[PDB]
């Protein structure tokens, strides 16, 4: 037996999975699932449906030009069986899988490089627009820290930043409404 691939989405088709459409011109279409089969019957384009490997290859989100992807092919010329050849082939598939995975990770990082700069720019714009929503001391807290600093001869800024650290550590949420007292 072997592993086929879905015509529509490219997922691996294992035995007894999906369905095959036999066309009168002589073409077989293997679908891994009824989702792909029904999209095919509705004549949807896999290149336009964004969840498909065809769309991802067309959009350039799959690593396609790479030396590790040239090892797997449909071999139409059979080779006489050789035990050492099959064992060294198995070792080759394992090493090729490791190399291909780590190259794919490098490819994805090269795709996703600019996110940090975009997020930093957006954060700077949001902070500059909404400086007034940053956490601050209460009026009673400022009064009590000022009187404690006056009593102890300490820095009001020091007590203010210590209380800011404490309030940043202790996060509390607010509840809607409130109980009405019975008479």
């Amino acid at each position: 037996m072997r592993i086929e691939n879905c015509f529509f989405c490219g997922r691996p088709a294992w035995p007894s999975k999906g369905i095959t459409f036999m066309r009168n011109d002589g073409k077989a279409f293997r679908f891994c699932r009824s989702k792909c089969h029904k999209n095919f019957k509705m004549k949807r384009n896999p290149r336009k449906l964004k969840w498909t490997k065809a769309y991802r290859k067309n959009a350039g989100k799959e690593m396609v030009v790479d030396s590790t992807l040239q090892f797997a092919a449909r071999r139409n010329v059979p080779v006489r069986y050789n035990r050492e050849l099959w064992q060294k082939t198995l070792k080759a598939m394992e090493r090729i899988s490791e190399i291909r995975a780590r190259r794919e990770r490098v490819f994805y990082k090269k795709r996703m490089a600019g996110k940090r700069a975009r997020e930093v720019a957006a954060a700077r714009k949001l902070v500059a627009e909404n400086e007034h929503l940053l956490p601050r001391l209460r009026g009673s807290e400022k009064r009590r820290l000022a009187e404690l600093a006056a009593e102890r001869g300490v820095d009001v800024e020091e007590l203010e930043r210590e209380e800011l650290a404490k309030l940043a550590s202790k996060k509390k949420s607010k509840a809607f409404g409130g109980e009405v007292r019975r008479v």
């Binding site: 202790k170 509390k172 949420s173 809607f176 409130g178 109980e179």
Partner: protein, 110 residues
């Protein structure tokens, strides 16, 4: 170890409690399962829901109950004379950024 007066914040997964329920009964059923959740959590048969919590449950119609809700349940002493139950729960809606990803947390008394 735990005193009679204690408040905690919970996340109620109302989606699995309202799965498959008739559309005209989903919001009253959600109110009933909130009462049942509070009774099972705090041991009090007397459960009182905030009207803002009722508004939050009924916000999207009779069949638009949110999947998850963040509530605060407060067990308080019932000081009225001739009381069958000495404790009761009061359940409120909690203003949070997003109700997912939160744990059950004890609300500080101060």
């Amino acid at each position: 170890a735990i005193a009679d007066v204690v408040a905690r914040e919970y996340t109620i997964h109302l989606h699995k409690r309202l799965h498959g329920v008739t559309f005209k009964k989903r919001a009253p059923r959600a109110i009933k399962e909130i009462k049942k959740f509070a009774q099972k959590a705090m041991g009090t048969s007397d459960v009182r829901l905030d009207p803002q919590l009722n508004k939050k449950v009924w916000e999207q119609g009779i069949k638009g109950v949110p999947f998850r809700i963040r509530v605060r349940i407060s067990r308080r002493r019932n000081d009225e004379e001739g009381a069958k139950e000495k404790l009761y729960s009061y359940v409120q809606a909690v203003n949070v950024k997003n109700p997912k990803g939160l744990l059950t947390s004890v609300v500080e008394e101060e």
